[PDB]
Amino acid sequence: WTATSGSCKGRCFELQEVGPPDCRCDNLCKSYSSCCHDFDELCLKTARGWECTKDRCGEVRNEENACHCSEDCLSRGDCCTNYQVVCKGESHWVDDDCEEIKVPECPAGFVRPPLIIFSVDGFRASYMKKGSKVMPNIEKLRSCGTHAPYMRPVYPTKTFPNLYTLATGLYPESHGIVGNSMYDPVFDASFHLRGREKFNHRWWGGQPLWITATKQGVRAGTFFWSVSIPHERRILTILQWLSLPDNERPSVYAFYSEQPDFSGHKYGPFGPEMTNPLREIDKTVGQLMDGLKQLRLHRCVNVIFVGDHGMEDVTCDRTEFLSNYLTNVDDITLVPGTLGRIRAKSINNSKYDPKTIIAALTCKKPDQHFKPYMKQHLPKRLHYANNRRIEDIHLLVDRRWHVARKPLDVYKKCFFQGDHGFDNKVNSMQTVFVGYGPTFKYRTKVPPFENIELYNVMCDLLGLKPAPNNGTHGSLNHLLRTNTFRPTMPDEVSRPNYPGIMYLQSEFDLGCTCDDKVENKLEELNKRLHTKGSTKERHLLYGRPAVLYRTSYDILYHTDFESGYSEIFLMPLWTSYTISKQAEVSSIPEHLTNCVRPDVRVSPGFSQNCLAYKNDKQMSYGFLFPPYLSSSPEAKYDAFLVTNMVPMYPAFKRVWAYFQRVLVKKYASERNGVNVISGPIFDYNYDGLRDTEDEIKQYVEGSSIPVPTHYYSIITSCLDFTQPADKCDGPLSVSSFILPHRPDNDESCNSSEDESKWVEELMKMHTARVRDIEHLTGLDFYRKTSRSYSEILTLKTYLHTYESE
Numbered sequence: 101w102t103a104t105s106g107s108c109k110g111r112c113f114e115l116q117e118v119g120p121p122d123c124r125c126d127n128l129c130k131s132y133s134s135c136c137h138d139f140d141e142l143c144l145k146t147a148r149g150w151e152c153t154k155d156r157c158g159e160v161r162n163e164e165n166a167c168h169c170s171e172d173c174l175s176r177g178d179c180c181t182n183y184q185v186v187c188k189g190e191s192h193w194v195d196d197d198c199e200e201i202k203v204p205e206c207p208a209g210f211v212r213p214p215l216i217i218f219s220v221d222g223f224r225a226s227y228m229k230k231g232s233k234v235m236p237n238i239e240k241l242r243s244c245g246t247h248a249p250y251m252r253p254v255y256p257t258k259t260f261p262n263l264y265t266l267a268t269g270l271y272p273e274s275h276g277i278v279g280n281s282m283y284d285p286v287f288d289a290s291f292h293l294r295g296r297e298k299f300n301h302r303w304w305g306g307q308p309l310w311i312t313a314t315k316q317g318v319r320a321g322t323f324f325w326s327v328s329i330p331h332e333r334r335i336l337t338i339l340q341w342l343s344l345p346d347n348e349r350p351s352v353y354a355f356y357s358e359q360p361d362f363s364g365h366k367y368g369p370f371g372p373e374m375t376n377p378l379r380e381i382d383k384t385v386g387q388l389m390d391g392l393k394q395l396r397l398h399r400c401v402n403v404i405f406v407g408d409h410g411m412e413d414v415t416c417d418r419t420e421f422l423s424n425y426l427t428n429v430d431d432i433t434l435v436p437g438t439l440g441r442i443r444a445k446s447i448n449n450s451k452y453d454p455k456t457i458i459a460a461l462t463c464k465k466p467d468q469h470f471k472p473y474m475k476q477h478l479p480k481r482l483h484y485a486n487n488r489r490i491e492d493i494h495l496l497v498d499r500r501w502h503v504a505r506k507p508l509d510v511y512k513k514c515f516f517q518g519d520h521g522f523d524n525k526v527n528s529m530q531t532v533f534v535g536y537g538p539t540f541k542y543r544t545k546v547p548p549f550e551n552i553e554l555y556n557v558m559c560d561l562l563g564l565k566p567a568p569n570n571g572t573h574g575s576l577n578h579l580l581r582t583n584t585f586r587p588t589m590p591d592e593v594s595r596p597n598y599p600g601i602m603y604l605q606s607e608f609d610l611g612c613t614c615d616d617k618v619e620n621k622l623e624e625l626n627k628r629l630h631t632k633g634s635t636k637e638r639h640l641l642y643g644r645p646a647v648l649y650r651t652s653y654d655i656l657y658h659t660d661f662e663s664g665y666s667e668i669f670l671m672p673l674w675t676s677y678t679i680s681k682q683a684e685v686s687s688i689p690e691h692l693t694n695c696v697r698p699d700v701r702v703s704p705g706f707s708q709n710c711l712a713y714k715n716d717k718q719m720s721y722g723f724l725f726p727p728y729l730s731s732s733p734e735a736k737y738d739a740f741l742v743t744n745m746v747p748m749y750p751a752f753k754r755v756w757a758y759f760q761r762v763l764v765k766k767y768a769s770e771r772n773g774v775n776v777i778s779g780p781i782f783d784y785n786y787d788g789l790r791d792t793e794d795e796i797k798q799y800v801e802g803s804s805i806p807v808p809t810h811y812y813s814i815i816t817s818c819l820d821f822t823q824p825a826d827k828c829d830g831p832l833s834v835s836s837f838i839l840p841h842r843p844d845n846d847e848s849c850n851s852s853e854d855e856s857k858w859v860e861e862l863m864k865m866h867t868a869r870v871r872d873i874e875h876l877t878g879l880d881f882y883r884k885t886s887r888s889y890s891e892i893l894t895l896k897t898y899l900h901t902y903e904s905e
């Protein structure tokens with residue numbers, strides 16, 4: 101109930117909401133059908149349009165007009181945005197040359213530069229180049245300010261999940277808005293685009309920017325606009341808010357445009373009908389900037405122009421139907437479209453089995469345009485699993501396609517030629533970032549970055565302390581002239597032990613054997629020096645990683661590699677080695693095929709054993725430093741140490757062997773040496789965070805040897821590839837992956853073929869940021885470089901995506 105008989109006189113676009121049954125006058129009241137009776141008359145005036153004309157100049161104030169050309173309008177704060185151009189011979193902001201804003205040039209009484217966030221739905225990154233002739237205001241912002249060639253949305257690349265990621269710095273799994281459509285079983289409720297349930301606060305986790313601002317005494321303009329409120333009125337309302345007295349004036353403002361998403365759905369991303377919506381967004385930007393210039397705020401305010409996601413070509417005929425795969429298609433609920441989420445239609449059906457559904461969807465058709473996953477098997481870079489609202493079964497749908505349940509769902513609902521929601525590495529899903537103002541840099545290009553990083557920056561721009569989030573604070577310091585946040589490396593929590601030779605061969609009863617009984621003081625001092633860390637500067641280029649939790653571990657040195665060996669997990673947490681451009685691949689000699697050797701620096705009781713592997717019929721083993729890349733026949737014995745051993749399903753060893761035997765060498769050749777850090781990951785509860793021992797669900801049978809869920813590698817070299825990796829004087833270049841450790845290769849539909857036809861494609865799918873690996877391991881990499889910490893943080897957030905230009 102709303103007693104809609106109160107009035108909006110004097111309250112148009114009021115900044116505090118008021119409680120039912122009092123009638124409302126704020127920018128959201130329409131959407132709650134709670135505006136007072138006179139809201140349209142008083143607050144949504146349209147008379148005479150939005151631009152001054154010559155004949156309106158000097159006019160007698162008529163309060164019915166939408167905006168004013170009278171002489172008192174600047175002081176009233178309600179001129180049309182073009183008032184000074186038409187009536188005072190001033191130029192449009194876009195027509196002025198751009199001049200560096202070295203300091204904020206603000207009116208008296210402004211305590212800090214305001215922030216205005218201009219967000220555009222569906223603004224695909226390539227629109228900046230492809231639409232540049234029709235968006236001159238936006239291009240001025242872009243080329244005078246700071247810009248990225250694109251910004252990476254989060255998965256799914258839907259509107260609500262991304263807008264709220266922009267608001268919070270959080271992955272959808274953490275903030276709760278895991279789709280545009282959702283079911284929450286604890287609430288027993290559903291969240292739809294259409295309706296009232298989405299306004300209930302319990303869907304929305306984290307702490308969005310407006311709440312962060314409010315709690316720390318920064319005033320926020322209300323971010324959300326009811327869809328009927330036209331764009332021109334939203335701009336004028338912001339400009340009016342900026343004229344408020346110092347004690348009532350907000351410091352942060354938001355404008356949201358439904359375009360160009362709305363049209364892109366209809367016409368496709370590059371449909372000829374798309375030119376006009378781009379013109380119109382540009383015109384709106386023009387109005388804002390002309391409005392700010394009138395208020396002498398155009399060298400005071402920081403303006404962010406940011407998109408939520410791009411848009412891709414998608415038509416009804418490119419739909420896959422689950423009815424062409426499953427027999428039991430009525431026993432499932434599908435959340436459909438550019439991604440697929442499947443659950444049981446009824447929780448009183450005990451005959452529902454996800455395993456059989458997945459198998460019925462796996463590699464069934466040769467050209468298949470989706471891939472099923474249990475959510476915990478999705479690529480870790482998507483961070484799309486740790487929420488009750490994400491269904492156990494997920495379909496990653498190919499770009500340009502839809503998935504639906506039955507054909508009746510497509511025709512009883514072609515209409516659309518554009519959609520989004522695909523994997524966030526897809527080019528067509530990328531979106532835009534431009535920052536313009538005193539706090540942003542002048543004429544600067546920055547590298548692409550992920551939209552989860554922006555919450556921190558917006559907090560920096562307003563002098564707020566960010567709530568805990570998934571950004572890496574400092575990774576975008578390079579966007580900012582000032583207001584930088586100066587981060588420090590986390591403290592190491594556990595220091596290593598450096599064990600020497602403490603145990604005799606015969607103390608070990610591991611069931612391991614090695615044909616190594618083959619015996620010189622020249623090469624005996626030499627190997628002592630290799631066990632004490634003589635070659636470590638070669639193999640450990642960036643310092644040892646820091647262990648950020650309490651544990652017991654040993655640094656072990658070898659001729660070709662260095663490891664941090666965990667007495668708790670009975671394996672390395674990390675193995676570091678350098679492979680030069682010139683290095684050579686050998687094979688494992690025949691006599692050493694099954695060779696595993698006791699490590700005389702580590703007790704039997706903190707060692708794996710071979711018997712467990714023999715008794716575990718599912719589980720085999722592999723090595724972290726590969727025997728194939730040994731520098732000499734003698735050094736190769738080090739690679740068969742029990743302390744280099746890790747558990748591997750036979751199906752995973754095909755992947756791992758190919759990576760170690762072929763791909764490491766290929767990368768060394770191409771990148772002029774590489775440093776490699778490899779290791780295990782345990783994420784049984786799929787939260788993206790390092791497991792404690794008591795969370796491990798699987799061990800090598802009859803042993804305390806825990807089974808990793810994944811294996812990682814971080815592959816570093818010199819960005820200037822004319823310098824070798826081991827003697828790089830400048831910035832670094834990195835690619836990483838987090839491979840799922842799976843007992844089959846069902847994910848790769850061509851896995852019965854040679855490893856050269858599928859292994860690399862799989863690795864690409866599971867590309868990762870170093871930072872993802874940090875979360876999953878509790879390690880901190882790149883502790884000892886000559887590079888600034890900001891630059892390293894930027895490096896740690898880099899993702900190698902393998903899309904073309």
Ligand SMILES: *[C@@H]1O[C@H](CO)[C@@H](O[C@@H]2O[C@H](CO)[C@@H](O[C@@H]3O[C@H](CO[C@H]4O[C@H](CO)[C@@H](O)[C@H](O[C@H]5O[C@H](CO)[C@@H](O)[C@H](O)[C@@H]5O[C@H]5O[C@H](CO)[C@@H](O)[C@H](O)[C@@H]5O)[C@@H]4O)[C@@H](O)[C@H](O[C@H]4O[C@H](CO)[C@@H](O)[C@H](O)[C@@H]4O[C@H]4O[C@H](CO)[C@@H](O)[C@H](O)[C@@H]4O)[C@@H]3O)[C@H](O)[C@H]2NC(C)=O)[C@H](O)[C@H]1NC(C)=O
Pocket residue numbers: 270271273274275276302303304305306483486487488568569570787788789875
């Ligand atoms: C990305 O960044 C984010 C933010 O930094 C990271 O997420 C944080 O991770 C922390 C560690 O996992 C986590 O800390 C826990 O908080 C528990 C209390 O949390 C409440 O309060 C906070 C603070 O305001 C609030 O934000 C939380 O909101 C969550 O839940 C509501 C739903 O009720 C949602 O609206 C909201 O979206 C959010 O949901 C998300 O997070 C929860 C986890 O909190 C997930 O389960 C959801 O799926 C969803 O993703 C909460 O309202 C606190 O109780 C925990 O403490 C337990 O564990 C500690 C270990 O130190 C142990 O010592 C304690 O004994 C305690 O155990 C007890 O409870 C156990 C479980 O019931 C029980 O088994 C035990 O026996 C004990 O009884 C813990 O400290 C923090 O909440 C989240 N924050 C957010 C916003 O998600 C995220 O990790 C980053 N991602 C990556 C990949 O790095």
Ligand SMILES: O=C(c1cc(OCC2CCOCC2)nc(C2CC2)c1)N1CC2=C(C1)CN(C(=O)N1CCc3c(O)noc3C1)C2
Pocket residue numbers: 217219258259260263264266267280293309323324325327354356358361406
């Ligand atoms: O005002 C907001 C808004 C704006 C908003 O900014 C947050 C800012 C945080 C700081 O950084 C910049 C963004 N945050 C929210 C939610 C997260 C808290 C909401 N609205 C969004 C939408 C509408 C208006 C209408 N609507 C649709 O018509 N579609 C529904 C979604 C959709 C789709 O996926 N494709 O077409 C459509 C059509 C989506």
Ligand SMILES: [Ca+2]
Pocket residue numbers: 782783784785786787788789790791
């Ligand atoms: Ca975990």
Ligand SMILES: [Cl-]
Pocket residue numbers: 256258278279280281435
């Ligand atoms: Cl969705």
Ligand SMILES: [K+]
Pocket residue numbers: 713714715716717718719720
């Ligand atoms: K075995």
Ligand code: NA
Pocket residue numbers: 845846847848849850851852
């Ligand atoms: Na397969």
Ligand SMILES: [Zn+2]
Pocket residue numbers: 222259361362365520
């Ligand atoms: Zn859309």
